[PDB]
């Protein structure tokens, strides 16, 4: 009845006050918000990354806001206790408004969100109150206690936690005129911090007090794929999120493993990752170096990390015990997996969401070329073991027929005359397919 029961307010990529007056309310992909106390009250400052479409501004604040959320068209402010929310569009044509949420006993706003169609406010009790852009209420609903919120242009993603139902997420696309649902209270595989919260941590107690669940961010992708980051330091993507039956939770990045393999060999713990957004292998995250997990007021440059599957085995990686060497046998397989998942993700948005930048087809073609190159390398590796059935099985997934001809050449050159006939038979079958 304590600890995780504290539905303390949380905003994406939040920050605790710590030992100073500077606090980061939110770090979306479009900017960050910081608060400083003027010895009696807070002065909010909102900055934007894409300087050229927005202009940063700072205003005096008297209510002491605890929640924030930045969109491409406006930002929303919230309060934990007596949670009077405030919504302020960036453009001056739309006038900002404030509203007072219905607060009950023991109630406290946990997360806030906004969308050009509707604005959504969370509640520790589990309410799902929503309003229009201009503040007029639209509907009031009750669900499992909401702890976090993050919204894309037209879709809203939330994670519900309760002491009885557990961590349940829900991805709902409000839409301009059609509230098409995609998930509702479905279980999620995120690992809540339990062992690490058993009074054994250094400088992490304050951050865990700031966020009981330790979930750092719920940022989307450039193609609408939800992503999760927290204590386990592994991204969680929704590959086939369009179909509820096709739900897929794929760990796409392993922060600790990548940090170790780029650090020279040490299992360094002084490097902490604060993710901001992900866009097609481009994970923007501040890599703070020190004992403090959260960054400081001079927000460092958002260094980019690339996605990598947790296929890296320690036993194979410690071949050269101490530019960490990578096993070439497994490196190509991991590249195959990455190309596979990226192609699958891109195909979902190709026919449905349409072209986004005008180069998705070309990058998909290059990715498919690399996908078949990985298959060719694995085919050669299997042929190196004189396992004809292994190469035959791997050759059935080839996409380009020119790669299949290259596989024929590999079979005819890698001391495998018997593989020649089977790969030629596959090619001849593909003639009619």
- Binding region for another protein (CB under 8 A): 20-22, 29, 36-39, 43, 45, 47, 49-53, 55-58, 276-277, 279, 282, 284, 287, 289, 296-298, 300-304, 354-358
Residues 6 or more apart whose CB falls under 8 angstroms from that of 262 comprise 324
Local structure of 35: helix, strand or coil? strand
Q: How far is the CB of 54 from another protein (least distance, A)?
A: 9
CB of 427 to another protein, least distance (A): 37
The CA distance from 329 to 312, in Å, is 11
- Tell which residue, 73, 61, 38, 15, has the closest CA to residue 272: 15
The residue (of 305 and 406) whose beta carbon lies closer to another protein is 305
Looking at beta carbons only, is 36 or 250 nearer to another protein?
Answer: 36
Give helix 328-351 / helix 360-384 axis angle, nearest 10°.
Answer: 150
- Residue 235, φ and ψ in degrees, nearest 5: -70, 150
Query: Least Å distance between CB 98 and another protein?
Result: 17
In whole angstroms, how close is the CB of 139 to another protein at the nearest point?
31
Distance CA(109)–CA(80), nearest Å, equals 5
| Identity of the residue, 34 or 130, whose beta carbon is nearer to another protein in the bound complex | 34
Between the alpha carbon of residue 124 and those of residues 129, 138, 166, the distances in Å are 12, 20, 14
In the complex, minimum distance from the CB of residue 327 to another protein, in angstroms, rounded to a whole number: 24
Closer to another protein by CB, 106 or 358: give it: 358
Whichever of 27 and 380 has its CB closer to another protein, that residue is 27
Q: How far apart are CA 252 and CA 239, in angstroms?
A: 10
Q: Could you tell me where the beta strands, DSSP code E, fall in 260-346?
A: 271-279, 282-289, 304-305
Q: Edge-to-edge strand order for the sheet containing 74-78?
A: 67-70, 74-78, 84-89, 97-100
Minimum separation from the CB atom of position 328 to another protein (A)? 24
Q: DSSP character for 345?
A: H
Instruction: Tell me which residue of 399, 261, 235 sits closest to 322, measured CA to CA.
Output: 261
Task: Please identify, using beta-carbon distances, which residue of 109 and 283 lies nearer to another protein.
Answer: 283
C-beta of 297: minimal distance to another protein in Å? 5
DSSP 151-208: E-SSEEEEEE--TTT-SEEEEEE--SS--EE--SSEE------SSTTSS--SSHHHHH
Coil, strand or helix at 46:
strand
Instruction: Name which of 289 and 402 has its Cβ closer to another protein.
Output: 289
Name the minimum Å distance from CB 290 to another protein.
Answer: 11
Nearer to another protein, 268 or 393 (CB): 268
């Amino acid at each position: 009845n304590t600890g995780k029961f504290r539905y303390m307010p949380f905003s994406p990529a939040g920050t605790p006050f710590g030992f100073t007056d500077r606090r980061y309310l939110t770090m979306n992909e479009v900017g960050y918000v910081s608060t400083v106390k003027n010895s009696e009250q807070y002065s909010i400052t909102v900055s934007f990354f894409d300087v050229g479409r927005f202009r940063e501004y700072h205003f005096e604040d008297l209510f002491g806001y605890d929640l924030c959320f930045l969109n491409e068209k406006g930002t929303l402010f919230g309060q934990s206790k007596t949670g009077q929310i405030q919504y302020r569009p960036h453009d001056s044509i739309h006038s900002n408004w404030t509203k007072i949420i219905p607060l009950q006993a023991g109630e406290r706003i946990t997360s806030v969100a906004a969308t050009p169609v509707r604005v959504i406010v969370g509640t520790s009790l589990g309410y799902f109150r929503s309003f229009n852009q201009f503040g007029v209420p639209f509907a009031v609903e009750k669900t499992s206690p909401i702890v976090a919120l993050t919204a894309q242009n037209y879709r809203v993603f939330s994670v519900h936690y309760s002491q009885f139902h557990g961590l349940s997420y829900s991805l709902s696309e409000l839409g301009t005129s059609s509230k098409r649902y995609y998930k509702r209270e479905c279980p999620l595989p995120m690992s809540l911090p339990n062992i690490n919260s058993d009074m054994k941590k250094d400088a992490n107690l304050d951050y865990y007090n700031f966020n009981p669940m330790g979930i750092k961010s719920l940022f989307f992708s450039s193609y609408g794929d939800p992503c999760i980051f927290g204590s386990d330091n592994t991204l969680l993507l929704l590959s086939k999120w369009r179909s509820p039956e096709e739900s897929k939770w794929l760990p796409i990045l392993d922060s600790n493993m990548e940090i170790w393999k780029m650090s020279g060999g040490k299992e360094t713990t002084d490097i902490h990752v604060w993710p901001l957004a992900l866009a097609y292998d481009t994970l923007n995250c501040i890599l703070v170096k020190g004992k403090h997990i959260w960054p400081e007021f001079p927000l460092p440059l958002p260094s980019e990390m690339e996605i990598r599957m947790p296929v890296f085995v320690k036993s194979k990686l410690l071949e050269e015990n101490k530019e960490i060497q990578i096993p070439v046998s497994m490196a190509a397989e991991e590249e195959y997996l990455r190309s596979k998942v990226l192609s699958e993700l891109l195909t979902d948005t190709l026919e449905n969401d349409g072209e986004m930048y005008g180069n998705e087809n070309e990058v998909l073609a290059a990715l498919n070329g690399a996908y078949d190159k990985a298959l060719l390398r694995l085919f050669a590796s299997a042929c190196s073991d004189q396992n004809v059935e292994k190469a035959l099985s791997l050759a059935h997934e080839l996409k380009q027929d020119r790669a299949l001809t290259a596989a024929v050449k590999i079979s005819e050159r890698a001391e495998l005359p018997s593989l020649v006939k089977k790969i030629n038979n596959i090619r001849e079958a593909r003639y009619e397919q």
